[PDB]
Structure formats: C-alpha cells, structure tokens
C-alpha cells in the first residue's frame, strides 16, 4: 500500500510510487529522478502514463525497457497541463535529470514536491519567486545541524589537485573512481580532464552515461580501458582487495593506484576540513573518501525553507521513527519562529 506523503490530494497523481502495484485512482505517475529507491517497481510491463524529465525518459526507455508509448517527457521551466492540472518541472540540483514538481491544484492550493534536491540560492530566482506555496513535500535527508559538508566546487578542487599531483610525480599511477548509480559525474570528468585522458568503463556504465545529454560526451568517455588512465569501477570494488585485483588485470602498465570513493556525509566531517583529508593506504594503493553531496546541508535546507515560507511541511526522508519525526518538527518550528511566518 502507498503511503500518504506520496499522494497529491485533489489530483489523480502520485510521486515516486511504483512499488505498490496499481494505486487506486492514479491516472498519472510522476518520477522525480532515476535512483532505485524511487523507480522501484518500473519495467517493460508497466502500462500507465509516466511523467518525468527528458533525461529520466532516456533512462526508462534504454535501461528499464519501458515502452515508448507510456513515457511522457516534459521540458523544464514551462507551464504544462497534465490531466487537467497545471504543473511545472524545475531543476533539483541532484543527479542528471532530477526535478522538483510544482502542482497548481484546481481549488487554488499550490504544492511543491522537491524530490531529492540540493538547495541553492539560485532557486530563489526560478518560477518559485512569483507566488505562494501552501504545502512543501521536502527532502529531509540531512535535517540536523551536525550535517555539514563543503561546496561541490571545493570538493572537486581537492580531487583535481590530488590526482594531478600524484600522476605528475608518477606517470605510471592509475586513477580509479567508484560509482553505483547516476549522479556525481563531475568527480571522474574533472579528474580525466586535468589528466588529458578519456574515462574508461564497462559497457553497462557507458550505456547509462550515453542517456544523460552531457555535451561532447563522445569526447570524454570510452569502453577501451587500455587507452584510459582514469577508470570507473563499481563502488563495491573500491577496497584494497578489489583494487589489487584490478591492477593485476592492467598487465604491468601501472604500478600504483589512487582511488576516490564519493560518499555522502560521514562523521569525519565533524572534525576535519576538506584541505586536511588523508587517504587509507596499503602498499602502492591509496583510497580517498570525499564528501561530494547531492543533498542539501542543514544550513542550505534551512535557508531555502525560510525563504519559501510554506504553510505546511511534509518530510519525505527519515520518516520511519518517532524520534526522527519529532526532531524534524522541532526544527521546522524554530525556523518559522525565527523568520516570522
């Protein structure tokens, strides 16, 4: 059965609700982004209308085989009517293709569903500026003040400088970057660009990147691992065993690996500046965990919500415990008393 925080009252619509079978009364299923917790249940046998971005549409067609007749892509920043209701898709600053959805209900209520997002001041000059929002369905992944991390630009600066230094000291070092989903592509793309290399990967991961509308992609990536000195590997292989095993396969081309594991937040954030991050090292293998987040920090979330001033907030993450729900409700009430809405 479909929970309440995935239904849009007064419409036939759901959001990110494909794991419950046929939802009673649902005439249109919205997909915010192509992350497995959110698409859970879609396949080539799905026969209802799916509304989403162009990029999410390319991934449902080519990776999940959903038939073309049921894929409904919408452009961003554009007023659209779906089954009698005005909707707008906005960039969520999450992974490629990810959106927030503005719904203009027939009774005059306006609802924003953030999907997954990384709040930014630039969102204060989208189509959100123009009018009031009564209900906010909010990505609360990091809704507690301990959750701090740097900007994506500082993190990428660190990774570029680390890789360029190492390969300039040792032209025989290989760089490896872990992945398990779409998102965070800037980590491996910026490193390969400083090194003057394409990024090497499996046929399956190449397929996924080819769906993403990245300009000049054919100039940036390849399936020919032998010619490339930046390789992608599944995240589960980013450990001393998996990496040893990978260097053997390269046939004595390389004598050192430097690897990156993008994570979300970890507790080493609470004591260490990005500058001061150090790897784990065994022999000729070094592994850096870097806090590249595609979700809002506490401070970014708080700024967005204090600016939007919604009448009601419905969290969509961390909803499973009484303590989580109570904690989030306390912070929504401080934010509201501090800003005066």
Residues that bind Ni ion (CB under 5 A): 35, 116
Query: CB 182 → Ni ion: shortest distance, Å?
Result: 9
Report, in angstroms and rounded to the nearest whole number, the Rg of the chain calculated over CA atoms. 22
Residue 141 or 228: the one with the smaller Cβ distance to Ni ion is 141
Query: CB 94 → Ni ion: shortest distance, Å?
Result: 6
Query: CB 273 → Ni ion: shortest distance, Å?
Result: 27
Query: CB 38 → Ni ion: shortest distance, Å?
Result: 6
E strands, the chain, in order: 7-8, 13-15, 28-30, 50-52, 71-73, 80-82, 85-91, 99-104, 110-113, 135-138, 173-179, 199-200, 221-222, 230-234, 256-263, 280-282, 285-291, 312-315
Residue 18 or 254: the one with the smaller Cβ distance to Ni ion is 18
Residue 184 or 302: the one with the smaller Cβ distance to Ni ion is 184
Nearest C-alpha neighbor of 134 from the set 293, 313, 10: 313
Q: What is the DSSP string of 16-45?
A: S--SSSSPTT-SEEE-----HHHHTT--TT
Residue 7 or 35: the one with the smaller Cβ distance to Ni ion is 35
Query: CB 264 → Ni ion: shortest distance, Å?
Result: 10
Rounded CA-CA distance 307/70 in Å is 37
Residue 56 or 162: the one with the smaller Cβ distance to Ni ion is 56
Q: Is the dihedral of CA 240, 245, 247, 252 positive or negative?
A: positive
């Amino acid at each position: 059965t479909c929970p309440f925080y995935k239904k849009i009252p007064g419409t036939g619509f759901t959001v990110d609700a494909f794991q419950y079978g046929v939802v009673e009364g649902c005439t249109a299923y919205f997909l915010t982004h192509f992350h497995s917790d959110h698409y859970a249940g879609l396949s080539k046998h799905f026969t209802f209308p799916v509304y989403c971005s162009e990029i999410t549409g390319n991934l449902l067609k080519n990776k999940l085989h959903v038939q073309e007749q049921y894929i409904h892509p919408l452009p961003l920043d554009t007023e659209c009517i779906v089954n009698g209701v005005k909707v707008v898709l906005l960039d969520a600053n999450h992974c490629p293709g990810a959106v927030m959805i503005l719904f203009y209900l027939p009774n005059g209520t306006v609802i924003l569903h953030t999907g997954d997002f990384r709040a930014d001041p630039s969102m204060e000059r989208s189509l959100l500026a123009d009018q009031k929002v009564h209900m906010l369905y909010l990505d609360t992944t990091y809704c507690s003040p301990e959750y701090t991390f740097p900007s994506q630009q500082e993190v990428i600066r660190f990774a570029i400088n680390t890789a360029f230094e190492a390969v300039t000291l040792n032209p025989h070092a290989l760089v490896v970057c872990g992945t398990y989903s779409i998102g965070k592509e800037k980590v491996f793309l910026a490193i390969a660009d400083v090194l003057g290399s394409k990024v090497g990967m499996s046929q399956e991961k190449y397929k996924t990147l080819q769906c993403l509308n990245i300009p000049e992609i054919n100039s940036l990536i390849t399936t020919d691992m032998c010619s490339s000195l930046v390789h992608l590997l599944p995240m589960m292989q980013i450990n001393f065993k998996g990496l040893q095993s990978h260097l053997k396969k390269c046939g004595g081309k390389y004598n050192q690996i430097l690897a990156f594991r993008p994570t979300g937040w970890t507790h080493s954030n609470k004591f260490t500046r990005i500058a001061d991050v150090i790897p784990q090292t065994k022999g000729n293998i070094s592994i850096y965990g870097i806090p590249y987040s595609e979700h809002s920090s506490y401070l970014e979330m708080k700024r967005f919500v204090q600016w939007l001033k919604p009448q009601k907030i419905i969290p969509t993450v961390n909803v499973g415990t009484w303590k989580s729900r109570s904690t989030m409700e306390k912070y929504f009430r401080e934010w509201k008393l501090e800003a005066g809405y």
